[PDB]
Amino acid sequence: MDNRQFLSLTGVSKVQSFDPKEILLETIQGVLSIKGEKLGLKAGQVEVEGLIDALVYPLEHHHHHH
Amino acid sequence: MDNRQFLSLTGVSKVQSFDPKEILLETIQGVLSIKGEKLGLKAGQVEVEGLIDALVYPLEHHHHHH
Numbered sequence: 170m171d172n173r174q175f176l177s178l179t180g181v182s183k184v185q186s187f188d189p190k191e192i193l194l195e196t197i198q199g200v201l202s203i204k205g206e207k208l209g210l211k212a213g214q215v216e217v218e219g220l221i222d223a224l225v226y227p228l229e230h231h232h233h234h235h
Numbered sequence: 236m237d238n239r240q241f242l243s244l245t246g247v248s249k250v251q252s253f254d255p256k257e258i259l260l261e262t263i264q265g266v267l268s269i270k271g272e273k274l275g276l277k278a279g280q281v282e283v284e285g286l287i288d289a290l291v292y293p294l295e296h297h298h299h300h301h
Contacts (some may be wrong), residue, residue, distance in 0.1 A: 174246040180237055197238040197286060200299045209245075214241070220266060226290035 172220050176203065179214040190218065201226050242269075243282040250281075258283060265293045 185200060186194040188228035192203040201224075216222065236278040244260065244267075251266060258269045260281065267290075274285035 171246060173265055174244060174263065177243055179273055180240040196240055197287065197288065199287075201290060206249050217301060220263060223294045223296065224290065224292035225291070225294055228270075228289045 172180065172182060173218070174221060175216060175218055177214060177216040179212075181215075199229075238286040239284065240287065241282070241284050242287065243280060245278075245280045255285075256291060264296070267292050 173193065177208055178201075180196060181208065182195045182197065185195050187194075188203075189208050190206070203217070203221065204223040205219045205221040208217055214217060237287060244262065244288050245289075247260045247262045248290075249261050251261050255270045256271075259298045262268055269283070269287060270289040270291070271285050274283050274287075276282070
């Protein structure tokens with residue numbers, strides 16, 4: 170079926186990197202990493218077109234008991 | 236600037252849990268979890284506004300351990 174999706178975000182703190190195979194943008198204070206394939210201004214907003222095959226974001230906050 | 240940001244996503248298979256302090260949307264690959272505060276329609280699209288302080292997504296797919 171259609172697994173393609175669009176992801177948009179703004180208020181980015183800085184552009185750590187921008188690649189069609191991986192995009193890294195730091196927002197607020199954490200860093201968001203986008204992984205997928207075929208990831209190809211105004212309002213100061215940015216949009217992205219491609220299928221997300223994975224997402225990784227450090228959750229520096231989890232401690233858990235065991 | 237600021238910490239508030241706009242985030243929208245489409246092509247979601249089904250909503251698992253929609254809460255203002257937590258959102259779990261079952262989309263391609265698996266389920267995307269979003270954590271923060273104040274995280275909250277035609278076209279079948281979903282829009283969420285708020286400060287994202289943490290993001291957790293399962294990057295399994297293939298085995299990778301050391």
